[PDB]
Amino acid sequence: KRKTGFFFDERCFWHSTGLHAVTLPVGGWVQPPAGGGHAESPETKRRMKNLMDVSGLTPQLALRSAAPASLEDLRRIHPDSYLERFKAISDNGGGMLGKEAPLGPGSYEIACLSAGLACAAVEAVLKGELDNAYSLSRPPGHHCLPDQSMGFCFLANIPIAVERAKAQLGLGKVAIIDWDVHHGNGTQHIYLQRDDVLTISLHQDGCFPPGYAGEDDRGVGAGEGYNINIPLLAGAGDDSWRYALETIVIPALARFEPELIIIACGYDANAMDPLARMQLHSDSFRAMTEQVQQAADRLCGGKLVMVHEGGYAESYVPFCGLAVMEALSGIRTEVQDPLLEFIQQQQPRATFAQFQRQAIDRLAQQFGLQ
Amino acid sequence: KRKTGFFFDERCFWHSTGLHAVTLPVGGWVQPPAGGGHAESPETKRRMKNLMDVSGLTPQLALRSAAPASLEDLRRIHPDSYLERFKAISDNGGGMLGKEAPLGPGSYEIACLSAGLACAAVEAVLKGELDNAYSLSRPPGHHCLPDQSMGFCFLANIPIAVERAKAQLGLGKVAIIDWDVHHGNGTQHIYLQRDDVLTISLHQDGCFPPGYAGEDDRGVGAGEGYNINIPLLAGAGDDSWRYALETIVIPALARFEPELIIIACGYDANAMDPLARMQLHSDSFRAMTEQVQQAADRLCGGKLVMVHEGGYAESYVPFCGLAVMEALSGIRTEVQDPLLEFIQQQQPRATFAQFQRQAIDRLAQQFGLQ
Amino acid sequence: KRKTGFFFDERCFWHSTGLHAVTLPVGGWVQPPAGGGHAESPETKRRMKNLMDVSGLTPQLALRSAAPASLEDLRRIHPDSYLERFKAISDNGGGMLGKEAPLGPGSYEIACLSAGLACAAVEAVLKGELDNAYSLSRPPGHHCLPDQSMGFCFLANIPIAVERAKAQLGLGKVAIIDWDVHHGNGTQHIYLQRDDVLTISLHQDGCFPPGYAGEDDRGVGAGEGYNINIPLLAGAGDDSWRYALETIVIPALARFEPELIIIACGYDANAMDPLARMQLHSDSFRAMTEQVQQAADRLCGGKLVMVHEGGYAESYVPFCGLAVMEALSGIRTEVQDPLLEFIQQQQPRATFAQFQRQAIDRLAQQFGLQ
Amino acid sequence: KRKTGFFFDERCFWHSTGLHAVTLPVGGWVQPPAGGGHAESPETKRRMKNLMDVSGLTPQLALRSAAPASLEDLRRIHPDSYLERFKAISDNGGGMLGKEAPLGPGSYEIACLSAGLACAAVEAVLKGELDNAYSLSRPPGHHCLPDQSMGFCFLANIPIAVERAKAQLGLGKVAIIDWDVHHGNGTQHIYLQRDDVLTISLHQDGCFPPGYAGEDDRGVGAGEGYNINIPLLAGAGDDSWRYALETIVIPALARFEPELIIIACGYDANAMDPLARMQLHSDSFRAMTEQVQQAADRLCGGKLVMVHEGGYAESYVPFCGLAVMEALSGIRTEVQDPLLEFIQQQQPRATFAQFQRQAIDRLAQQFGLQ
Numbered sequence A, B, C, D: 001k002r003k004t005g006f007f008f009d010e011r012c013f014w015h016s017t018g019l020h021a022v023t024l025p026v027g028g029w030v031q032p033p034a035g036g037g038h039a040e041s042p043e044t045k046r047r048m049k050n051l052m053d054v055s056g057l058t059p060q061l062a063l064r065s066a067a068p069a070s071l072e073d074l075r076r077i078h079p080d081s082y083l084e085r086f087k088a089i090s091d092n093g094g095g096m097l098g099k100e101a102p103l104g105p106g107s108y109e110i111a112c113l114s115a116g117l118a119c120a121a122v123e124a125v126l127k128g129e130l131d132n133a134y135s136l137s138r139p140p141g142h143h144c145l146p147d148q149s150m151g152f153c154f155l156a157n158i159p160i161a162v163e164r165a166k167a168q169l170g171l172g173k174v175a176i177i178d179w180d181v182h183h184g185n186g187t188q189h190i191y192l193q194r195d196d197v198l199t200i201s202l203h204q205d206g207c208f209p210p211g212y213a214g215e216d217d218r219g220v221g222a223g224e225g226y227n228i229n230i231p232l233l234a235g236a237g238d239d240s241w242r243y244a245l246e247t248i249v250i251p252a253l254a255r256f257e258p259e260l261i262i263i264a265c266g267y268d269a270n271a272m273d274p275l276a277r278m279q280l281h282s283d284s285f286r287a288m289t290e291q292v293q294q295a296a297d298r299l300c301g302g303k304l305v306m307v308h309e310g311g312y313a314e315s316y317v318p319f320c321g322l323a324v325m326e327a328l329s330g331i332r333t334e335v336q337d338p339l340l341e342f343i344q345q346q347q348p349r350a351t352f353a354q355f356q357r358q359a360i361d362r363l364a365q366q367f368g369l370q
């Protein structure tokens, strides 16, 4: 029993993105969906929170909202030309922020809140008010570039919070581990030339951005050696993800000695996700959380923040999220994941598993960790 | 330009299955979905048909319905105790046909129609009225056992049609190739001891039934050598599926010399499916159709029937289906798959590809085809 | 058994309108809907067609599509400034055609088709190819003004067809009876000064446009006496609507002696509609169709066209539509409306009924028909 | 600024009812809905709560849950044969509690909670812990009979709470005013022979139960004069409902002198509801709440509890609910109902209004209040 913060706000569930057929834009040869048409849907996030409430976990956590991120907070990462364009589109009823970047009315102010929840989570943990913290930040941040929206992300949530903590709370070295199944291209870009932040991304080889693996992208100038990409094979499951973490990430954290670990916590590597091809189950996410909590215990006095990114499986993500929040709080509810055993049976056999283990061995050797 | 039959009936879209959160049954810790709750949804199938209509393809096909399969047709595969129980549940408003087998009111008569469309497709092609044919059979059939519903399947559609054509149309040897991403366990069971039907299943290793691969299950007694399972690795994409077909399936058809090829045609290996982890795109399905049409040209005077099975990606399956129907008819519409290039970029790199190629080489050697 | 045309096209179901919470625009204090968000939804229209197919009625009808209405057809009603603006918005991905007028990508070409179905229905009946005809025209037309979209209507479907038949088929006098529950303000405006068309609207007093009754709006100049508005009381049911028709509309048709009767056929006076407060059931719509078919038998050699307008009750409109198509074709299927008896029991008691009868008496006296 | 209790629990939103097309059961000629299929949907209730949160009202209220109603609580109203049957169906995965009474897995325990929220609301107000209180009780109660489920109601929520307060808190006379648009037949039956409770129902003449008005049903034996039914005319709006309240209900409360007023608070008389034909807007519900709060100020030291019943308009009910909670708390947020002015314009003209006023005059004279 740690004191665990859960930062959320009902207004984050109000952001919308127009009419899509799953995640395809309607029009041309894409027929409008007969029902639901939300690209980045609030339902997964709300269902996680709803399950935390009925399981009895929520009253045992420290619940918080936050003030939105200020214009000054945003300007540590983003230029005003981008910000002004995003706000213009938001203020005028929603629309497109260049192609494939759909937002809705009031999305600007809801993105600032999202980023503000991450800012406050980082601060509460840094000041010792909380041992650790989870931010239910929607819309997500990890694909966002300084001057370009991408992958449903409009502001760089984690970098905004980190930059703000560097300027106002004397934060030093920080490691950002991104286990959303997609590549954290926005985080990578922002800290590419910087040695005061270690950015690690585990992701499906080639998934999004499409065709990017990135094992050879290590950082530039002072930043060289401070960016790690682990492109796992599509189809990998629990054994592979946990081995990448044991074999690459924990050793890399040990070498870098951070003052704070931040997880970019997506659940879209879960076995039922339509936006990737990985095979994780809720125990996978429980075990990964355990491993990074333990690292944090060893390295930075238990200081761990998690910020929600992706996950599109509407009925399965809540179990994965509850599992994380259970591991992070050290409280186990009575909930039993009704798919766990089914997904355990689907996991890749030893041939694939050994092959992926070998690929991860080669990566750790390439990064000087073996 | 072949004369291509498309067998469908509006009533097949009326079958329902109760309230699910995606495919999880509601209750316990599964919250009811805020919108749509259909496990096996008509929308994918209807959207395929809708796209065939607006693209201008439908008027170029021979459209047909059928009479439902008779009780006598069904009794060539299923015992009366199963049939009577299914009909009882259907007649009484729907319910459960043992656990994980949900059906709705009138589902019995709609399953008989579904099976009847497959019966008529097979017959029209066998009697030379059509060169080839597609049946939009819902509910699906390939998981159904003689006395047990499974995987959303209630009657064994393809075996019913095949048994009926053996009894009434002098049908001899027939090959059934199942490229739904899941294992065709129902077909396998029914023809396991039989040498007059070759059952081939390509499927994701371990997906459904969960934990089953099956490479060593080859047939029993007279049936030995007449069942082929190809458990591809989760994550495999276009290169792998087409290589399994070139390297195992076409050679196996050449050895067996059928009078008719039947595809159990699922689209749930498409890259956006929540019910498996494969990475096929619409050109994948186009190329696989081409390869089996060409085989049929070489072996049985072009006689090819395809029967719809699975596929859960609501916005993507229609493009995969249109692609098949375009390849089967030899008519190319103006439709361009808006995801094709994106999914091509996501395909596994050469390391994985060569590894899966090697695994398929070993399988073909084990089955005496190399 | 008449020869009855049913004009429809799958592409009309592809028009979309963005994200609404029922019919409220999302944003501000309107939370995005957790599921379906279609203001003017294709589902009601598709469900009607689906029910006509499974009941066995569809094969007994003459099914037709049409060529879209040409630019020249549209310019008999609409100026180019409006048309160009509508097309611009459509061509650029959808948007707003002034406030409360939402459309989607490609809506222009789908509106032209909709209007084209009405054009062709009118022509087939006028040339004696069909005895009568129904057009499943979506999007609807009756609220559209020459230069302004309103009430989900973008082109004036019926006026376009009528103007075209006047220019190319020597059409003379025509009566347009609008029993959509809302006021046919677009039709009224277009023919207000004209004595060659009688426009009658039955509508809920004050519903839409909001606050408009219109009993005193009779026509202007040559058009005076050629426009009839019957503002029925909210809450009125079967007895009232059928009495308005017996007492006002049929006598008005007798006085005017048309060559063609066109019904603007909405079903949003049905007892389950969220967009008005009337209490009609499927037998109501059956009886109203009978009365106008009989009038047409007496006045213009049975020449009757019906064009779909409104109706938002997703589960109930199909029964109302099937009823109309049954009455118009003279074919009764086996379908029994499962709500009919329930809605019959809800109908207003004699106090209200006599009061509304008296109000209609006064209207007919004001219009010189009693 | 009163101290206002809001009693709610996330688990009440988890109750489900199977697959319906709006509120029609699927099967036969009712096609399954392509999206959402919830007869009694949690979305209206959740959206009200969500709007209370984003408007800033929620933190100003006293938020509470409750213990479920005990078996002993339930047995003051319901016999064990009914209870055991309801629980059996709930425990076995859901089903039907006789015809048209659909429930889902775990619905029993969720109905007990619902009733428990009402019990606790009544108690907090009676013991002076709160000035007034609202219970977001789902599933609803007012149609439920002792031994029969009806109108989506499974336990008699308000009678259970009232009977419990009579047995444990020395509660005397209580008035129950039911302004859900449907008849409160369950409440009426339970207190029909009793003079210690005044049951008043305003409802749409004939709506549900279908064909029931009830002006002549006044009570039986000791209960005679203690039951008042006001069957308003379908179509009535703000003026009519508020006049029925001024002219019948407040005078009837003055005569009876209660210790507690309980509102059975449905919102299904709102102008956009598909389950009735009334024309109320959010200011209607605000004004009705004001009038009964003021009565309570005059008669029972401000003691007022409201228990949620019906309301099916998903986008409009939240505004009606927020309005009530604003009037009950005495706190006005910044929210402005985006439909208010539109619905004000739709209201029936003076002819209808005077006619309904006269009908209400006659009712008050029949009940000895004029």
Ligand SMILES: CC(/C=C/C(=O)NO)=C\[C@@H](C)C(=O)c1ccc(N(C)C)cc1
Pocket: A023, A024, A025, A143, A151, A152, A180, A181, A182, A208, A266, A268, A275, A309, A310, A311, B338, B339, B342
């Ligand atoms: C962006 C994303 C996930 C983000 C997230 O979860 N961030 O981590 C996934 C892909 C499948 C997607 O939705 C998409 C849609 C349309 C399209 N084209 C029209 C070319 C290309 C891609």
Ligand SMILES: CC(/C=C/C(=O)NO)=C\[C@@H](C)C(=O)c1ccc(N(C)C)cc1
Pocket: A338, A339, A342, B023, B024, B025, B143, B151, B152, B180, B181, B182, B208, B266, B268, B275, B309, B310, B311
């Ligand atoms: C059956 C199937 C696909 C069939 C098809 O497409 N046939 O080819 C897929 C799986 C994901 C599924 O839906 C499921 C649901 C619940 C569950 N448990 C409650 C244990 C276990 C599995």
Ligand SMILES: CC(/C=C/C(=O)NO)=C\[C@@H](C)C(=O)c1ccc(N(C)C)cc1
Pocket: C023, C024, C025, C143, C151, C152, C180, C181, C182, C208, C266, C268, C275, C309, C310, C311, D338, D339, D342
């Ligand atoms: C237009 C229409 C029906 C048309 C049709 O059926 N034509 O006959 C109905 C009304 C209820 C409507 O949807 C609406 C929505 C929003 C709004 N404001 C935001 C002020 C005002 C009105």
Ligand SMILES: CC(/C=C/C(=O)NO)=C\[C@@H](C)C(=O)c1ccc(N(C)C)cc1
Pocket: C338, C339, C342, D023, D024, D025, D143, D151, D152, D180, D181, D182, D208, D266, D268, D275, D309, D310, D311
């Ligand atoms: C029960 C109710 C509202 C309750 C509520 O809001 N309580 O106050 C409304 C009616 C419209 C309904 O849904 C219905 C459905 C089916 C049916 N038959 C199949 C005959 C008859 C009626």
Ligand SMILES: [K+]
Pocket: A191, A192, A193, A194, A195, A196, A197, A198, A199, A219, A223, A226, A227
């Ligand atoms: K870095």
Ligand SMILES: [K+]
Pocket: A178, A179, A180, A181, A182, A183, A184, A201, A202, A203
């Ligand atoms: K990642």
Ligand SMILES: [K+]
Pocket: B191, B192, B193, B194, B195, B196, B197, B198, B199, B219, B223, B226, B227
């Ligand atoms: K075999």
Ligand SMILES: [K+]
Pocket: B178, B179, B180, B181, B182, B183, B184, B201, B202, B203
């Ligand atoms: K297969």
Ligand SMILES: [K+]
Pocket: C191, C192, C193, C194, C195, C196, C197, C198, C199, C219, C223, C226, C227
């Ligand atoms: K006129």
Ligand SMILES: [K+]
Pocket: C178, C179, C180, C181, C182, C183, C184, C201, C202, C203
């Ligand atoms: K009208």
Ligand SMILES: [K+]
Pocket: D191, D192, D193, D194, D195, D196, D197, D198, D199, D219, D223, D226, D227
């Ligand atoms: K009483």
Ligand SMILES: [K+]
Pocket: D178, D179, D180, D181, D182, D183, D184, D201, D202, D203
């Ligand atoms: K009532």
Ligand SMILES: [Zn+2]
Pocket: A180, A181, A182, A266, A268, A309, A310, A311
């Ligand atoms: Zn992601």
Ligand SMILES: [Zn+2]
Pocket: B180, B181, B182, B266, B268, B309, B310, B311
């Ligand atoms: Zn499958």
Ligand SMILES: [Zn+2]
Pocket: C180, C181, C182, C266, C268, C309, C310, C311
């Ligand atoms: Zn209308």
Ligand SMILES: [Zn+2]
Pocket: D180, D181, D182, D266, D268, D309, D310, D311
């Ligand atoms: Zn009600």
